[PDB]
Amino acid sequence: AFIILDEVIKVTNRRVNAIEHVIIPRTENTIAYINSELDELDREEFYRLKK
């Protein structure tokens, strides 16, 4: 049981550290990039609509 918990603790810590380390920045950058592209497209549409 001690070898089983010591064997599972490294996989849990490595999976939590890898997922927590690699999880946030891709969608965190892509959401702001897509929102900035949508806002730039909306401002480019309104600027052409005002003329």
Add this chain to the structure above:
Amino acid sequence: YGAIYSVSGPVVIAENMIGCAMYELVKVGHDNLVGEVIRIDGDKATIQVYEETAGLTVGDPVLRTGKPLSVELGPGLMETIYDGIQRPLKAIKEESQSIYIPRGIDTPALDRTIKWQFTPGKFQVGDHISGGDIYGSVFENSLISSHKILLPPRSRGTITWIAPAGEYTLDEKILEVEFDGKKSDFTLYHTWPVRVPRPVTEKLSADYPLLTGQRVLDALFPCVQGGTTCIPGAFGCGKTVISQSLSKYSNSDAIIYVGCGERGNEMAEVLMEFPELYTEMSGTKEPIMKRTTLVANTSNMPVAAREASIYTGITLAEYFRDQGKNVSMIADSSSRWAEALREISGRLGEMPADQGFPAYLGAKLASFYERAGKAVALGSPDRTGSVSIVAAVSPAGGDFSDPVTTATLGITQVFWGLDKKLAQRKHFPSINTSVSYSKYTNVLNKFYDSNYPEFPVLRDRMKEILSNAEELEQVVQLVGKSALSDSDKITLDVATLIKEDFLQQNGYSTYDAFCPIWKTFDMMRAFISYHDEAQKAVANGANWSKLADSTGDVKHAVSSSKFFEPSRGEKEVHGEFEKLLSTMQERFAESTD
């Protein structure tokens, strides 16, 4: 002068433009509503209105005020609440019986119900005068006058007529200037545009060693008069308690409170809570209200008063800096003025930008931080002045990554964070060294270290000790306390006592809202000497329980020394902290042997 040609939306168009500039503000119609001509297109002028346009028909008269939209500088400014457009709420409460500005009602920019006594300065008949020179003195309070009567900037001449001493109103004249014949009449109140910066003698770097009344904030970073610093907020997450505690606990000559886009609940609590507080400047005459200037504009007001509120407060702080005194300008926040600029730009017809912000917000954000600063006072006297700008930041687009806080963080040279758990813990402010930085601590530690400072060595070892204890707290929490070094427990124990005694402050007494620099330097030097003596005693062979149990009343006595009076050594030095080094050296020598 002009006639109303057409009205479309919230902006009214007035024709008959035969010389009216696009910078002067005028009142359209018989109601005298607030408005300003932002642009002109041919004979018809386009004027933006910051109020309801109900009751305005085609053919109404338009009369200009004869000058741009700015604030008036005169005596009797303390203990009064006005708006950004020179609208006093006290006259509206007396006449209209309301707080908000009503439609079709106009009030004066200066209160004509209170008069002050004007005294002659060092200017005689036929003496030379210039812009910024001290022409006399005007009483602004019942205890001490701080309103210095000076001439307008960018002007000069000879004083042909000087009035005598006595009480007079702001509308009446007291002096006359002769420059190329009959130049004009001079009074107590002067005009100054809010969109134009006040002139000065010469600008310099912020190196004035002035304190703001923050023990943990002054201990973590050296406060200077004339610098630029931004503080993050959450719309009432602890910024109002830090601004009210910083303004009330401050010991400056003047205080500038600017409410641009507040909800209105903190404005009444700051005005009613300001007179109940006790100032630390040797006086009890309503010093919290009389010693500070209150300009509060709520969310139910026009965008011109909220946008021009920071310009009027920065213009009043520039006039107080030009008078020869250091004033602290605390404005919350720039997000309401940045949203009001995009709201006025969308209604006026301006094009959009990135993140929904206008293109003028980048130049106005740099001009707002460049308007305040420490330099030489303008005029023949050459006095020393300073203006500290404290602007709050909040989200206005749906997140904290907007261009206002991003451009304000890059433009500013000092950052002060604010943790929500520390604000919930009754600690104000809850900023840490790992979430804040400042590059102006070299000049403040150079001059304040030049007088009698020890802030540099205790500040660097205190920031490194807090950064080492903050990193050691996660290793002590995750790994445990049965496998770490003994120096990490002494560093975390000294960081917990220094963070509890320094960061823990909510205005419980008069000694907790105003601490001297020598008491904070001796308090940090006692903790640094206790941590260094504990690490040196533990390095030579010793137990942690022998030193912690060996300290005893010294550790609890060192934390309870902030509730007493600071007059222990001569008038401001702590005498108990000086004698603690002998007991710490005797305990360190006894713990080693």
Add this chain to the structure above:
Amino acid sequence: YGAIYSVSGPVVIAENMIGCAMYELVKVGHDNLVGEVIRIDGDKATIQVYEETAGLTVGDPVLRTGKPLSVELGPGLMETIYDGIQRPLKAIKEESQSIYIPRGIDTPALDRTIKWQFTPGKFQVGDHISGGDIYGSVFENSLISSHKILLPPRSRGTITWIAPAGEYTLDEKILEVEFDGKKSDFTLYHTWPVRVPRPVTEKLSADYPLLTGQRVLDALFPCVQGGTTCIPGAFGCGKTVISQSLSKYSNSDAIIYVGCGERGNEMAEVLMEFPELYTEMSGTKEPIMKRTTLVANTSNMPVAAREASIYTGITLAEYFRDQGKNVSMIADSSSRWAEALREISGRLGEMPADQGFPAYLGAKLASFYERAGKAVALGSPDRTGSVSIVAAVSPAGGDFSDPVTTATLGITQVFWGLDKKLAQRKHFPSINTSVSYSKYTNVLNKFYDSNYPEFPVLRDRMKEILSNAEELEQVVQLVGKSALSDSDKITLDVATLIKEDFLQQNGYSTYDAFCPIWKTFDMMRAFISYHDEAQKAVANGANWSKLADSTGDVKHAVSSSKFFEPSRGEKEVHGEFEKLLSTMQERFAESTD
């Protein structure tokens, strides 16, 4: 003609103008600035002036050229540096006293002070002639005639006058065509519009392989002469090193360098480095500069030369392809011409598209990419030619979802990717199997397998190894190195070593940038046989660290083969790969046991 009534920015309006074609070029004012008539509004024509205006006053006359802007097609184009508007920088350097073309200067697209040697070809007196026939030749290169004298397109008749052998000027007639009487006199140069494609006999499928001298380019995805390729760049791909190595190490007889808004220093570095270099075809007396035609544009240069630089380079590539010689068209870059078209669309005041670019950029890019390609040369001889168009693109806001990159990559059939991780390690260019593809490698694999080794099996095995190593890098990075076998470590290490040695094509000399197909085929076959023998040796019982550490100098010897010169062995085939394959086969038996 007309008179300039309004001139604001890069758009000029001239009333009382006749003609006003959409593609007609004319010079307005007395300065003779470069311009083009874009559209017309009523009786006035709106002309877009791309040259710098530094005193061009409104009220002067406008002289229309009466035809579209184009360049001269004849002798004297190689060994010369010109702009996009056909401006000689050599005569403008001494005459104008400046290295760059200044405003308010006139210069033709062909030299009038040089003479060329006329040689009679197969076209004699009495025989019929047509457009595109080789009536003569000019001695330009030591191996073949680069500048061949040809007739203009859309012409026919009989040659009544044949000039003899000797030198002649470009202003004297040496040929006469008789077609219903005296038609006209012919010169050495020929006129052709840049806004119109050159005629041809018929189009054919590209089946001629075009070598570029790159191990990563030819090893990654094979391409033949007459195709289109798009490369998304971020200022890290090394377009200057790929243009100089593609022009010097290329197998084409002509090179067309077009500058679409470069810094100027990269064109001067490749221009000064081109004369000191040695040609691969045994060229002498500046063989790199004599066989290459360079058009140089700047970021602050005129927009007319930047917009007409691709049409002038494609017209020169079509004129050189019509004579029967292979030419390579390198465009750097299409984003500079698309940004100039987007700035012209914003300056014109029309309805633009998303991202600022115009809607005609996709049709102009599809027509420019569709204009190039391999086909039969025009003329009665029916010679074979080819034109390979390689244009790089970059984003305008920091993303790869722009219309220029998507429209250029959508119309093209070859894609050259770019990785920031491989580009960060000094790899110009970084081409992977997931971000690259080419359908012409299968047709080129037959002639490449007939006149060379089996590169098509090594390309599919290298792409299959890189496809498994790409998922193995993310799987080993995400989960860890304790969840994979020893077989994937040899594929990841072999893909990292082959990607590192194959990706780096810049080096620090002339030996790390020019690699033949046999050296890349033997180097890829050595790593493929080493990985295949290491997988079978590790499958029978072995360790990955014992096999990788057991290899030693055998793995570094194959990686160090790129540092050697390409002249070893017989002509291009190095004999070290045969002994390295036998040493890997001998080490494979020792690694198993």
Add this chain to the structure above:
Amino acid sequence: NTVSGVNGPLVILEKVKFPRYNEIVNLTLPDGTVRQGQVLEIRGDRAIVQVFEGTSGIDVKKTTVEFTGESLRIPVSEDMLGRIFDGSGRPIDNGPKVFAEDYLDINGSPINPYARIYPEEMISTGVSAIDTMNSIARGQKIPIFSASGLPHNEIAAQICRQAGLVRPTKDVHDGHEENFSIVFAAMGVNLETARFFKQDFEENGSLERTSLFLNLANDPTIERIITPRLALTTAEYLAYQTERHVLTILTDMSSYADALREVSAAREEVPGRRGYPGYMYTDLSTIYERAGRVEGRNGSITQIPILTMPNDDITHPIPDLTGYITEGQIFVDRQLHNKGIYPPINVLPSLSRLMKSAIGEGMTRKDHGDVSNQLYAKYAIGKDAAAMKAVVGEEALSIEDKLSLEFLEKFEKTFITQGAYEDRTVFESLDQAWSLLRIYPKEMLNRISPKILDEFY
């Protein structure tokens, strides 16, 4: 005639069509103030020009017009070094006179003296990470890319303050054959930053050889955007007249991009994406077009601009459009500055397109390019090995990841660490970089020649 109206910073006045493009005109107001500007738009019976003084307060029918008849030109002389002036070229900041012996007009280039050869001489700034990883030439430009929260003024003040002591040691190495000059133009900066840069320039001892251009955010954007063209024209005229390599610093780039991006909604032009105009590439390329070799073969112009991002994102038109025009860039990472290494400029995304032409055999070592490329690949391999080793831990760490993380930590803590005034040579940085790069094996190093590897490990 008279002023028809006013929209934004530009004023639309009605007058005759006698003025030309970029013609200097004067507007007379009824309050006793005169404003000068340049005619940016000329039409029939109307004109659109941007005034350099003020942005509001223009009369409609109470104003007068006066035609100057001269084009806009900046007066440059051989004595501009050692004076203080504003963004409009006026001596009102207590500096020297604005008089000049020569007057040349500007339309994008004074004479168009572009270089026709690659730059061979290398200019050292006094940083082993900056000069070693990016070989700056006499005509090549390399800007500093920073973020909101990093000391860009301390890095630019340290780079400008380093010039004066490393230049005499580099002059003996054949890296420079003439005197060096400095051209400082401030735009959109605070008074503490300009006073700190002037205090560092006066404390360094280069006050008489440098130029002072002060532009604030409270002034007009037309004068702030026109100040870098006059500063680059005066630096190019002084470098062309004196035959000396001048280094120009253009900071901040966000204020110059915000000045041209400010007037985008008060005109008849359609702006591009992100609110900026569609002609921002020509304005950004106009500053880079005045860089390179000068006439005579003894003078050059160096461009070292400071770019501060207003949002902290790498996907922006100012950093991508400004960095795409120049050759390479120097990126400053917040992770390196947060640890304590000074400066925080990392060499991971940094590169130089003209690093091979800047290095030779008389002013630098021949193996500096192989050690710079091997150290650049070992820095990214050590960063990827440290990032994979941080997530993976010590249960699946590779053998090469420990030496790559050790060489990345020793190189980041040894080569990246440097004082604000401590001089360092490229020969000692290459010798220390060879000893720091010697910990790797011979089989791993495959990006260098065998003679350079056998000569030195």
